[PDB]
């Protein structure tokens, strides 16, 4: 058999939840291109996500700290927030390519050296319009990244676009909210993870977070050692738990609230997806620990320091002598503006790329 | 609404094609575990595969080459995704599909194919080296990542699919990963060699496909620019994508198989790329190894990968007490050549390059 | 002289352990393997699952006390029951002087042993043990085989001690650096 687009669009309605966004339904792209057979909206839009240049360099950014010197890699993420996310909306019955197209593309605006650049590069930008990297991912899909010929950017669906500009906010389709939850949950129980293989995180420091002291001790866990064997169970009992309690808790507001639209929630008062009072609370504990424990250890702090100084050196140097910038960036100063083109062009930096740059501007 | 995995799988059928593998047909797994509460048997196996050290690994581990070279990892989301859109395609289990494209890759050592030449040729005496089969020893013995038994406790769809790609021919879905690799191998590394300026627009013109589909878009076959590359790259993947499925679509029907079971017994493979793409392919292949993996400083690379492992082969095998006490302990049960293959072939490019270097001076 | 020894001894097995441990080579659970690790440990009641810093400092010590003390008492013993009463004596004695008594020597015999198969079989210990192996190999076969790299003073000694030894004296001499730099400026 071949299975059309428009058969596809069919069985996903009438298979999905009420509330759950259909494909057919969709508020279309802003270009009009001819609608393929084959793959359905939101199947295409992920196929483009993932031949984008930016998430291309997921791969050669860092999670946490500065890459050079074995901690994940933003790719790695996002790979785990797709597995989260798209594992929660199954059980929910909601869009899962709608799902995974977001958690591809939400993590693409992000500067070199792990939210660090972020901070740094918004600091920089406080007089010419700042710098936040959901919008900078919006940026680059809707106008940097030029793959088509006939407009700039992926000319991707409303619905993704959507997800990427109202997830992390009532608002938004309940895929996307339901990414940055998992968003969230990734981010826990893998930090927990680098930071014990990295040994910076210390096995009798376990006891400070109770979800994890409760874990620990349900399996017999070895502390003071916590070998490998007892971290990936402690780490894959995390997630189960935290993914478990998503869907429970979610289906729970989405059935109180009475929703039976992907309008309905993107109109209602407040987000649904949740993870219930106890299970918000275990994770807020364990980013706070983490945060303490880990962010601010020394070691990560001192990589820190320097991912801060080379976007620094990279921006002073390039807006004080705009003609350090390759011919390509001064090209696009006039329609951008001097600091615009510099920002995007350090935002779209590699780690490696971006320390070598800092380098070869010094003797 | 809260999907159950007896729901799911209920679902999957019905919906799927008859020759599809249905997970409600899974001939089980090894080791007997509760069953899930919303994953199905294919969902927990991508899950459990996306979570070991061989595929984390492939994010250091290049494809081709060990800059513009792209990671086994970015291979395998692309095999990933060439197999997923022709799997819903023809209705075949999505899940198993990239459960087995996740995993098939696993088994190489680092640096290339380069990497399971020179291992097999050591090893001739002790048993050989074959990459689909370290896949299958790593996900059944060699990673502990659960108490009760060593490996990953696989189905035996996905087990089936790393082997087949165990019985004669497998399921669609394993028989299209295995295309799908072949397609992606193509299209990526055609255009790696032109981002790393080792092949030339202009040689294009040495595969009808190429030239053809250049000409047809009016790209610049004199100075190939990004842009143009881009909508090359994207049309051949387009291309072979499309002839995948008409060409399966209609062995399938040809055959009259309605189950999996029908697909792994019939006398032939099914999935198929038609007379003509498979003649395409087969001049791309072609093409890429004379003019990209045979091209001077690949082979300059090629050469340093097959001195590291060399290296680090006879220094372990030659002395053992080398090695970590870990590794010195699956000597027992393993025999010192296996073992040392087993701990060679599990590393990152990086670490075996940097172990070498230690074993020296 | 015979004292000078046995201190050789003692301070081996003190300090390998001490370097071993803060190398990271020995870990705190091995110490159960030497009875006299285990007994002093336990008894000030240190940390036997992570060897603390202040710890491994009271480990060292005591252990050390325990050796100077055992020499100290058993030597002299052996020195009255032998009756020896000058230099010269001890010199011609049929035995040596010098112990630990039964029950230290034993000890350290146990403690020796430990060491050779944690600390010095360590594969991280062996790898480094190779490459110095080559080193002195590469540099002997190069400047015998090869006089006319030597530097001309050690070149110069090989009429009055021959070649073989003029070089032996050559490398036995250098610095660990040195012998390491030598070695690397005889490749590319
Ligand atoms: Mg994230
Ligand atoms: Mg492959």
Known sequence: MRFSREALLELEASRLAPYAQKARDTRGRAHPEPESLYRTPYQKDRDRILHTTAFRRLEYKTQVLPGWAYYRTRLTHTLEVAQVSRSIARALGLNEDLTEAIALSHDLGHPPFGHTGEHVLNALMQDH????????????????????????????????????????????????????????????????????????????????????????????????????????????????????????????????????????????????????????????????????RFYRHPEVLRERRKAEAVLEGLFAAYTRYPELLPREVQAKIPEEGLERAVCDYIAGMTDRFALEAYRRLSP
Request: hydrophobic content about 45%.
């Open 129 to 292: 319009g700042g710098f936040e990297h959901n919008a900078q991912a919006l940026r680059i899909l809707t106008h940097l990244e030029v793959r088509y010929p006939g407009f700039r950017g992926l000319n991707l669906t409303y619905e993704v676009l959507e997800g990427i500009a109202t997830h992390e906010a009532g608002q938004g389709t309940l895929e996307a909210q339901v990414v940055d939850l998992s968003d969230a949950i990734a981010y826990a129980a893998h930090d927990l993870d680098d930071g014990f293989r990295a040994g910076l995180l210390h096995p009798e420091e376990l006891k400070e977070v109770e979800l994890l002291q409760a874990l620990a001790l349900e399996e017999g866990l070895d502390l003071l050692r916590l070998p490998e064997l007892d971290r990936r169970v402690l780490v894959r009992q995390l997630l189960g738990y935290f993914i478990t309690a998503a869907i429970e808790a979610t289906h729970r507001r989405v059935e109180e609230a009475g929703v039976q639209s992907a309008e309905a929630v993107r109109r209602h008062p407040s987000r649904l997806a949740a993870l219930g009072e106890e299970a918000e609370k275990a994770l807020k504990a364990l980013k706070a620990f983490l945060m303490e």
